[PDB]
Design a binder for this molecule. Structure first.
Ligand SMILES: CC(C)Nc1ccc2cnn(-c3cncc(-c4ccc(C(=O)O)cc4)n3)c2c1
Length: 273
Protein backbone atom coordinates (compact mmCIF):
# COMPACT_ATOMS: atom_id res chain seq x y z
CA UNK A 1 0.00 0.00 0.00
CA UNK A 2 1.30 3.35 -1.31
CA UNK A 3 -0.70 5.45 1.27
CA UNK A 4 0.77 3.25 4.07
CA UNK A 5 4.47 3.57 2.94
CA UNK A 6 4.54 7.37 2.40
CA UNK A 7 3.63 10.45 4.47
CA UNK A 8 2.45 13.20 2.02
CA UNK A 9 3.58 16.82 2.40
CA UNK A 10 3.19 20.05 0.38
CA UNK A 11 2.72 20.27 -3.37
CA UNK A 12 6.13 21.22 -4.90
CA UNK A 13 4.75 22.02 -8.36
CA UNK A 14 2.33 21.07 -11.14
CA UNK A 15 2.04 21.45 -14.94
CA UNK A 16 2.46 19.46 -18.15
CA UNK A 17 4.42 16.81 -16.14
CA UNK A 18 1.55 16.23 -13.60
CA UNK A 19 1.57 17.09 -9.81
CA UNK A 20 4.62 16.65 -7.53
CA UNK A 21 4.39 16.46 -3.71
CA UNK A 22 7.05 16.49 -1.03
CA UNK A 23 7.02 13.25 0.96
CA UNK A 24 8.70 11.05 3.54
CA UNK A 25 9.14 7.25 3.36
CA UNK A 26 7.53 6.12 6.67
CA UNK A 27 10.05 3.22 7.17
CA UNK A 28 13.38 5.15 7.25
CA UNK A 29 12.19 8.86 7.14
CA UNK A 30 13.94 9.24 3.70
CA UNK A 31 12.88 12.48 1.91
CA UNK A 32 11.02 11.69 -1.36
CA UNK A 33 9.09 13.41 -4.19
CA UNK A 34 5.71 11.86 -5.05
CA UNK A 35 4.81 12.48 -8.77
CA UNK A 36 1.24 11.82 -10.03
CA UNK A 37 0.78 11.41 -13.79
CA UNK A 38 -2.75 11.16 -15.31
CA UNK A 39 -3.20 8.08 -17.59
CA UNK A 40 -5.29 10.11 -20.15
CA UNK A 41 -2.26 12.46 -20.54
CA UNK A 42 0.29 9.68 -21.24
CA UNK A 43 0.84 9.40 -25.05
CA UNK A 44 4.11 7.38 -24.96
CA UNK A 45 3.99 3.89 -23.39
CA UNK A 46 6.69 1.24 -23.02
CA UNK A 47 7.59 -2.08 -21.45
CA UNK A 48 9.97 -3.15 -18.69
CA UNK A 49 12.46 -6.13 -19.00
CA UNK A 50 9.60 -8.28 -17.51
CA UNK A 51 6.91 -7.13 -20.01
CA UNK A 52 4.55 -4.84 -17.98
CA UNK A 53 2.83 -1.93 -19.84
CA UNK A 54 4.07 1.24 -18.04
CA UNK A 55 4.51 4.93 -19.17
CA UNK A 56 7.71 5.66 -21.18
CA UNK A 57 8.77 7.93 -18.25
CA UNK A 58 9.07 4.81 -15.96
CA UNK A 59 10.98 2.83 -18.67
CA UNK A 60 13.46 5.75 -19.07
CA UNK A 61 13.89 6.36 -15.31
CA UNK A 62 14.66 2.61 -14.77
CA UNK A 63 17.22 2.68 -17.65
CA UNK A 64 19.04 5.68 -16.03
CA UNK A 65 18.77 4.29 -12.45
CA UNK A 66 22.23 3.89 -10.83
CA UNK A 67 24.50 5.18 -8.03
CA UNK A 68 25.46 8.12 -10.32
CA UNK A 69 23.90 11.13 -8.56
CA UNK A 70 23.69 13.39 -11.70
CA UNK A 71 20.29 12.01 -12.70
CA UNK A 72 17.24 11.70 -10.40
CA UNK A 73 16.63 8.19 -9.00
CA UNK A 74 13.22 6.46 -9.33
CA UNK A 75 12.77 4.69 -5.97
CA UNK A 76 9.40 3.00 -6.73
CA UNK A 77 6.23 3.41 -8.81
CA UNK A 78 2.54 2.39 -8.50
CA UNK A 79 -0.42 2.06 -10.83
CA UNK A 80 -3.82 3.52 -9.78
CA UNK A 81 -7.11 3.27 -11.79
CA UNK A 82 -6.65 6.65 -13.56
CA UNK A 83 -2.97 7.50 -12.84
CA UNK A 84 0.63 6.40 -12.15
CA UNK A 85 2.47 7.43 -8.97
CA UNK A 86 6.28 7.78 -9.09
CA UNK A 87 8.40 7.87 -5.90
CA UNK A 88 11.54 9.88 -6.67
CA UNK A 89 14.53 10.95 -4.62
CA UNK A 90 14.43 14.37 -2.96
CA UNK A 91 17.67 16.25 -2.04
CA UNK A 92 17.30 18.42 1.09
CA UNK A 93 17.99 21.40 1.07
CA UNK A 94 17.25 21.83 -2.65
CA UNK A 95 16.52 24.58 -5.24
CA UNK A 96 15.81 24.18 -8.97
CA UNK A 97 18.16 26.04 -11.33
CA UNK A 98 15.30 28.29 -12.66
CA UNK A 99 14.59 29.66 -9.11
CA UNK A 100 18.34 29.90 -8.37
CA UNK A 101 18.96 32.05 -11.52
CA UNK A 102 15.73 34.06 -10.90
CA UNK A 103 16.97 34.87 -7.34
CA UNK A 104 20.69 35.38 -7.99
CA UNK A 105 20.69 36.70 -11.60
CA UNK A 106 23.41 35.81 -14.14
CA UNK A 107 25.93 33.33 -12.70
CA UNK A 108 29.68 33.86 -12.23
CA UNK A 109 31.47 31.90 -14.99
CA UNK A 110 33.24 29.60 -12.44
CA UNK A 111 29.79 28.60 -11.08
CA UNK A 112 28.26 28.26 -14.58
CA UNK A 113 31.30 26.08 -15.58
CA UNK A 114 30.79 23.68 -12.62
CA UNK A 115 27.00 23.52 -13.21
CA UNK A 116 27.31 23.12 -17.04
CA UNK A 117 29.99 20.37 -16.67
CA UNK A 118 27.69 18.47 -14.24
CA UNK A 119 24.79 18.81 -16.73
CA UNK A 120 27.07 17.44 -19.53
CA UNK A 121 28.02 14.41 -17.37
CA UNK A 122 24.29 13.81 -16.56
CA UNK A 123 23.27 13.98 -20.30
CA UNK A 124 26.21 11.72 -21.31
CA UNK A 125 24.96 9.23 -18.63
CA UNK A 126 21.43 9.32 -20.15
CA UNK A 127 22.80 8.72 -23.69
CA UNK A 128 25.04 5.83 -22.45
CA UNK A 129 21.88 4.28 -20.94
CA UNK A 130 20.05 4.63 -24.31
CA UNK A 131 17.82 7.53 -23.07
CA UNK A 132 17.19 10.94 -24.74
CA UNK A 133 15.95 13.54 -22.20
CA UNK A 134 14.35 16.01 -24.78
CA UNK A 135 13.62 18.69 -22.15
CA UNK A 136 17.02 19.90 -20.85
CA UNK A 137 16.35 23.31 -19.17
CA UNK A 138 16.89 25.24 -15.89
CA UNK A 139 13.49 24.04 -14.49
CA UNK A 140 14.51 20.36 -15.01
CA UNK A 141 17.72 20.68 -13.00
CA UNK A 142 17.77 20.47 -9.18
CA UNK A 143 20.67 21.81 -7.07
CA UNK A 144 21.60 19.67 -4.01
CA UNK A 145 22.79 22.78 -2.07
CA UNK A 146 24.88 20.90 0.63
CA UNK A 147 26.84 18.80 -1.91
CA UNK A 148 26.91 21.30 -4.88
CA UNK A 149 25.56 18.41 -7.05
CA UNK A 150 23.07 18.93 -9.86
CA UNK A 151 20.35 16.43 -10.70
CA UNK A 152 18.63 16.10 -14.08
CA UNK A 153 14.85 15.52 -13.57
CA UNK A 154 11.56 14.93 -15.50
CA UNK A 155 11.83 12.26 -18.17
CA UNK A 156 8.16 12.79 -19.14
CA UNK A 157 9.07 14.24 -22.58
CA UNK A 158 11.92 11.75 -23.20
CA UNK A 159 12.42 8.89 -25.63
CA UNK A 160 14.67 5.90 -26.19
CA UNK A 161 17.84 7.19 -27.88
CA UNK A 162 18.01 6.31 -31.63
CA UNK A 163 20.35 7.28 -34.51
CA UNK A 164 17.46 8.01 -36.95
CA UNK A 165 15.32 11.22 -37.24
CA UNK A 166 12.73 12.21 -34.57
CA UNK A 167 9.50 13.73 -36.02
CA UNK A 168 7.70 14.18 -32.68
CA UNK A 169 8.52 16.60 -29.82
CA UNK A 170 6.71 17.71 -26.61
CA UNK A 171 9.50 19.47 -24.70
CA UNK A 172 10.04 23.25 -24.26
CA UNK A 173 9.74 25.19 -27.56
CA UNK A 174 12.23 27.99 -26.62
CA UNK A 175 14.91 25.27 -25.99
CA UNK A 176 14.00 23.42 -29.29
CA UNK A 177 16.34 23.61 -32.31
CA UNK A 178 15.72 25.48 -35.62
CA UNK A 179 15.42 22.16 -37.56
CA UNK A 180 12.45 21.21 -35.33
CA UNK A 181 10.86 24.73 -35.74
CA UNK A 182 11.34 24.80 -39.56
CA UNK A 183 11.12 21.10 -40.61
CA UNK A 184 9.52 19.19 -37.67
CA UNK A 185 12.64 16.88 -37.80
CA UNK A 186 15.74 16.53 -35.52
CA UNK A 187 18.43 14.03 -34.46
CA UNK A 188 18.77 13.35 -30.74
CA UNK A 189 22.38 14.32 -29.92
CA UNK A 190 22.59 17.49 -32.01
CA UNK A 191 19.16 18.71 -30.66
CA UNK A 192 20.46 17.99 -27.10
CA UNK A 193 23.59 20.17 -27.87
CA UNK A 194 21.31 23.05 -29.09
CA UNK A 195 19.36 22.91 -25.76
CA UNK A 196 22.70 22.89 -23.87
CA UNK A 197 23.67 26.09 -25.72
CA UNK A 198 20.35 27.72 -24.60
CA UNK A 199 20.97 26.49 -21.01
CA UNK A 200 24.54 27.85 -20.92
CA UNK A 201 23.44 31.25 -22.33
CA UNK A 202 20.72 31.23 -19.60
CA UNK A 203 23.29 30.57 -16.84
CA UNK A 204 25.73 33.33 -17.85
CA UNK A 205 23.10 35.96 -18.99
CA UNK A 206 20.28 35.27 -16.52
CA UNK A 207 17.72 34.72 -19.33
CA UNK A 208 17.21 32.62 -22.54
CA UNK A 209 18.53 34.10 -25.88
CA UNK A 210 15.41 33.52 -28.06
CA UNK A 211 11.71 34.06 -27.44
CA UNK A 212 10.10 33.75 -30.91
CA UNK A 213 10.31 31.07 -33.64
CA UNK A 214 11.81 33.75 -35.95
CA UNK A 215 14.67 34.37 -33.43
CA UNK A 216 15.42 30.60 -33.16
CA UNK A 217 15.51 30.29 -37.02
CA UNK A 218 17.84 33.34 -37.40
CA UNK A 219 20.04 32.08 -34.51
CA UNK A 220 21.80 35.46 -34.02
CA UNK A 221 23.24 35.42 -30.47
CA UNK A 222 23.38 38.83 -28.70
CA UNK A 223 25.07 38.97 -25.26
CA UNK A 224 23.19 41.33 -22.89
CA UNK A 225 25.76 40.70 -20.08
CA UNK A 226 29.60 40.73 -19.86
CA UNK A 227 30.54 37.16 -20.93
CA UNK A 228 34.10 35.97 -21.73
CA UNK A 229 35.14 35.39 -25.35
CA UNK A 230 35.71 31.62 -24.76
CA UNK A 231 32.24 31.24 -23.19
CA UNK A 232 30.60 33.22 -26.05
CA UNK A 233 32.47 30.98 -28.58
CA UNK A 234 31.20 27.78 -26.86
CA UNK A 235 27.59 29.13 -26.77
CA UNK A 236 27.72 30.21 -30.47
CA UNK A 237 29.15 26.74 -31.36
CA UNK A 238 26.30 24.80 -29.51
CA UNK A 239 23.83 27.20 -31.20
CA UNK A 240 25.12 26.55 -34.80
CA UNK A 241 22.11 26.66 -37.20
CA UNK A 242 23.21 23.46 -39.02
CA UNK A 243 23.05 20.42 -36.67
CA UNK A 244 26.29 19.04 -38.26
CA UNK A 245 28.19 22.30 -37.30
CA UNK A 246 27.41 21.75 -33.57
CA UNK A 247 30.11 20.31 -31.26
CA UNK A 248 29.95 16.72 -29.95
CA UNK A 249 29.85 16.22 -26.12
CA UNK A 250 33.59 15.45 -26.33
CA UNK A 251 34.27 18.76 -28.17
CA UNK A 252 32.20 20.71 -25.59
CA UNK A 253 34.13 19.07 -22.67
CA UNK A 254 37.51 19.68 -24.43
CA UNK A 255 36.63 23.38 -25.06
CA UNK A 256 39.10 25.91 -23.45
CA UNK A 257 36.19 27.45 -21.45
CA UNK A 258 35.51 24.01 -19.84
CA UNK A 259 39.00 23.54 -18.38
CA UNK A 260 39.77 23.48 -14.59
CA UNK A 261 36.19 22.78 -13.41
CA UNK A 262 35.62 22.89 -9.64
CA UNK A 263 34.59 19.72 -7.79
CA UNK A 264 30.88 19.80 -6.64
CA UNK A 265 31.95 20.16 -2.94
CA UNK A 266 34.28 23.08 -3.86
CA UNK A 267 31.31 24.62 -5.79
CA UNK A 268 29.06 24.37 -2.66
CA UNK A 269 31.82 25.84 -0.40
CA UNK A 270 32.49 28.92 -2.62
CA UNK A 271 29.04 29.60 -4.15
CA UNK A 272 26.26 27.87 -2.21
CA UNK A 273 27.18 28.02 1.53
C1 LIG B 1 8.25 19.72 -9.98
C2 LIG B 1 9.55 20.22 -10.58
C3 LIG B 1 9.46 20.38 -12.09
N1 LIG B 1 9.93 21.53 -9.99
C4 LIG B 1 10.33 21.80 -8.69
C5 LIG B 1 10.45 23.11 -8.21
C6 LIG B 1 10.91 23.35 -6.92
C7 LIG B 1 11.26 22.28 -6.09
C8 LIG B 1 11.82 22.13 -4.80
N2 LIG B 1 12.06 20.87 -4.50
N3 LIG B 1 11.65 20.14 -5.61
C9 LIG B 1 11.97 18.75 -5.68
C10 LIG B 1 12.83 18.15 -4.75
N4 LIG B 1 13.22 16.88 -4.91
C11 LIG B 1 12.78 16.21 -5.99
C12 LIG B 1 11.94 16.82 -6.93
C13 LIG B 1 11.54 16.18 -8.21
C14 LIG B 1 12.07 14.95 -8.60
C15 LIG B 1 11.69 14.36 -9.79
C16 LIG B 1 10.77 14.98 -10.63
C17 LIG B 1 10.46 14.40 -11.97
O1 LIG B 1 9.60 15.05 -12.69
O2 LIG B 1 11.06 13.43 -12.38
C18 LIG B 1 10.22 16.19 -10.24
C19 LIG B 1 10.61 16.79 -9.05
N5 LIG B 1 11.52 18.08 -6.75
C20 LIG B 1 11.13 20.97 -6.58
C21 LIG B 1 10.66 20.72 -7.87
Amino acid sequence: PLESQYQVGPLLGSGGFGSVYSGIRVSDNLPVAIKHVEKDRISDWGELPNGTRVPMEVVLLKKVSSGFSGVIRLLDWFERPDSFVLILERPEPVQDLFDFITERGALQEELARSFFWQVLEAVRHCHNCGVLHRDIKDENILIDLNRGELKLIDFGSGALLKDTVYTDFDGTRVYSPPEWIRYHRYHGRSAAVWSLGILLYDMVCGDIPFEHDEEIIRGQVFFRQRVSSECQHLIRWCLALRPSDRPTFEEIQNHPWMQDVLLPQETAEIHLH
